[PDB]
TrEMBL record:
Transmembrane segments: none annotated. The chain holds residues 2007 to 2422 of 3729 of the full protein. The gene is tylG. This is Tylactone synthase modules 4 & 5. The lineage of its organism: Bacteria, Bacillati, Actinomycetota, Actinomycetes, Kitasatosporales.
Length: 416
């Protein structure tokens, strides 16, 4: 059970823990779920925050004693840094590589909001595909492979929408969105720029276009400033491209597999960190995409983009953008051109965003985010939702705790 605790000073928090310890001791057989709910609804919330997950009663009873006594404990997450009563959260929607087979299995069982958005995506998507996304997410035996590129992209879309729906139901709402590569499709849908219908079609046809070129190219992460990466890939010409600028010191390269192998072999030999991005067999944001362009305009048009409810920081432009302009030609640029994620995050920071949540099955961009934040001077927080092999209700609970503890507000009516 998540037990959310606050005081206007450390001492007040400490007392809040003793009262709670005492309450459960002076009221056993009283279930924490009822205590956890009034902990949230029955009381305001202040700048000194702690959160507790109860593996066992002895576990929590011990945990409350620790917090009450001012000593760290493994199961008691604390607010360390920014705690402005009204912190704003940016939902970050990364691209491919985050997928894992069972990522959905638990939340389809345990989380109503996740499930309904998943079934919604599945319906919308089925109009276009001769397979079921749900089938894949519940690892049904005859369902197609997660790894095929026309499967992964709709599936990860569904994931990133269903995770967003799950957070919002539990009272965490994006004040802005930024997407990396294909993730800009989910971001647009979460921001209200596309309908479900248009996003579904875009990711279905965009990803099906990619089947032609699966395994004729790849993408790598390298720890070099864009310019130093550009220096090194000149000699390959159109064989390689800058795929992403994620941070000062962090970037990505995509293109022909032979050329990547050479470049990485060179970089490793010089002791520069560069690795292939696992779970990608396509060269997004390279000149390989030039051969899909005509096919895409023929199949991926027309869409009906609209001004978004919340701001959209484009990683095509690297700036805020009227999402009215998210037409077919935009989505081709989304495929073709470099992901300007550093620029978008600089813009977010300078507009006063300081909490970035990766809303996806495994974090991809944490390190790059932390780097741009450090380099901007003024600081903030980076979170994730799920990790590989960590997508349980408890695991999202852990995420809620860290959300609460960083100044976000939870809806107890939802999680209780």
């Amino acid at each position: 059970v998540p037990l959310l605790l606050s005081g206007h000073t450390e001492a007040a928090l400490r007392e809040q823990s003793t009262r709670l310890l005492n309450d459960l001791l002076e009221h056993p057989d009283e279930h924490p779920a009822d205590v956890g709910y009034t902990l949230i609804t029955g009381r305001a919330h202040f700048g000194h925050r702690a959160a507790v997950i109860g593996e066992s009663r002895e576990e929590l009873l011990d945990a409350l004693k620790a917090l009450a006594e001012g000593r760290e404990h493994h199961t008691v997450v604390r607010g360390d840094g920014t705690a402005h009563p009204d912190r704003r959260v940016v939902f970050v929607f990364p691209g491919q590589g985050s997928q894992w087979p069972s990522m959905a299995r638990d939340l389809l069982d345990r989380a109503p909001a996740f499930r309904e958005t998943a079934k919604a995506c599945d319906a919308a998507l089925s109009v276009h595909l001769d397979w079921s996304v749900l089938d894949v997410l519940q690892e049904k035996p005859d369902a197609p492979p997660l790894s095929r590129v026309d499967v992964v992209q709709p599936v990860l879309f569904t994931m990133m929408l269903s995770l967003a729906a799950c957070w919002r139901d539990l009272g965490v709402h994006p004040a802005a969105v930024v997407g990396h590569s294909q993730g800009e499709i989910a971001a647009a849908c979460v921001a209200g720029a596309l309908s479900l219908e248009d996003a579904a079609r875009i990711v279905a046809l965009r990803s099906r276009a990619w089947l032609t070129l699966a395994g004729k190219g790849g993408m790598a992460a390298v720890s070099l400033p864009e310019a130093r990466l550009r220096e090194r890939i000149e000699r390959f010409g159109q064989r390689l491209s800058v795929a992403a600028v994620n941070s000062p010191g962090t970037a990505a390269v995509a293109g022909d597999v032979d050329a990547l192998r050479e470049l990485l072999a060179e970089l490793t030999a010089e002791g520069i960190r560069a690795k292939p991005i696992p779970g990608v067999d396509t060269a997004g944001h390279s000149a390989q995409v030039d051969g899909l362009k005509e096919h895409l305009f023929e199949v991926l048009a027309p869409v009906s983009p609209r001004s978004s409810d919340i701001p959209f920081y484009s990683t095509v432009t690297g700036a805020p953008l009227d999402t009215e302009r998210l037409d077919a030609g935009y989505w081709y640029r989304n495929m073709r051109e470099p992901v300007e994620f550093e620029k978008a995050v600089r813009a977010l920071i300078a507009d006063g965003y300081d909490l970035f949540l990766e809303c996806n099955p495994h974090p991809m961009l944490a390190m790059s985010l932390d780097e741009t934040l450090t380099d901007s001077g003024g600081h903030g927080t980076v979170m994730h939702t799920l990790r590989r092999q960590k997508g349980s209700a408890k695991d999202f609970g852990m995420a809620l705790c860290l959300a609460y503890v960083n100044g976000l507000e939870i809806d107890g009516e939802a999680l209780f």
